[PDB]
Curated annotation (Swiss-Prot):
Entry keyword annotation includes Signal: yes
Cofactor descriptive note: Binds 4 Ca(2+) ions per subunit. Binds 1 zinc ion per subunit.
Homology family: Belongs to the peptidase M4 family.
Catalytic reactions on record: Preferential cleavage: Xaa-|-Leu > Xaa-|-Phe
Enzyme class: hydrolase
Primary localization class, coarse: secreted
Protein name: Thermolysin
Keyword Protease carried by entry: yes
Amino acid sequence: ITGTSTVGVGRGVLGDQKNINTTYSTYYYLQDNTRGNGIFTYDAKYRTTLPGSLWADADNQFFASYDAPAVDAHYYAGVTYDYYKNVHNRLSYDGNNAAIRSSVHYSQGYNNAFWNGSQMVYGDGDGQTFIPLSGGIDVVAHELTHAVTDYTAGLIYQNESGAINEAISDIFGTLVEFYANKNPDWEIGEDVYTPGISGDSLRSMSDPAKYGDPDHYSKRYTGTQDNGGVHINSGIINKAAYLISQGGTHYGVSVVGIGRDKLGKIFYRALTQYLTPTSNFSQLRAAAVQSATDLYGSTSQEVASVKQAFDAVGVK
Ligand SMILES: [Ca+2]
Ligand SMILES: [Ca+2]
Ligand SMILES: [Ca+2]
Ligand SMILES: [Ca+2]
Ligand SMILES: [Zn+2]
């Protein structure tokens, strides 16, 4: 809507206070006009109809429990937009400042969040397995990254191409978590997963096997469940990414870490310049090697580490 840009204050899912960009026009709306064509957050009111109603508040103060998921979805979408703009010089997910829209309070006790090709959607969780999913910055960045992939490589959500699609979202979800410096780690969804159990997460990039996911190509899932194991086989790529950044010895193969910044540059270039809708793991390796070559030279340590990382997880 048309109005005056202002700043409100509220508390997120984890109880932390933060300032959020809003728009004033009779009511204060969760509409951030400071980033691209705007960031809009909607209330799905426990229904499944999308997007719902643009979030309206009477006093620009968001401290009600019902407000929490909206505050975080709105705020973290902004942080993610900043990451892509400041680090990769990319304006929003389409590269042309497309408006970012998110709906919270989707359905009842919904233990999931997703990008539906047009917007982000967040469930509130059942309170046991998950608390409102927008409370996790790696979750929000994971979803917005799916939008980036859709407008670039367009990786099909099935089999190996889908596993890469998933890994890319976990990789950048984690890089954004580090960017915001919010208790960063290489785990996925730890802030909103199982509130009654500390120390766990949905997936782990440092050790995918901790939760039963494969950490080597020889252990890849070949069934039909989960669209061919897109959330399972992503562990093979996540481990490779972790090794490239942090280094280590995996299955007898030693990798010299080159850091998170370079990991981000290498994968962003691979995603935007070399990957295609049907790319498989072997092609991702080639794309990553070529990207590192473009940026640091064929005889660089960076290229060496990328090769070692993929060798470590058995991807030739
Ligand atoms: Ca209020
Ligand atoms: Ca964390
Ligand atoms: Ca995390
Ligand atoms: Ca937990
Ligand atoms: Zn995903």
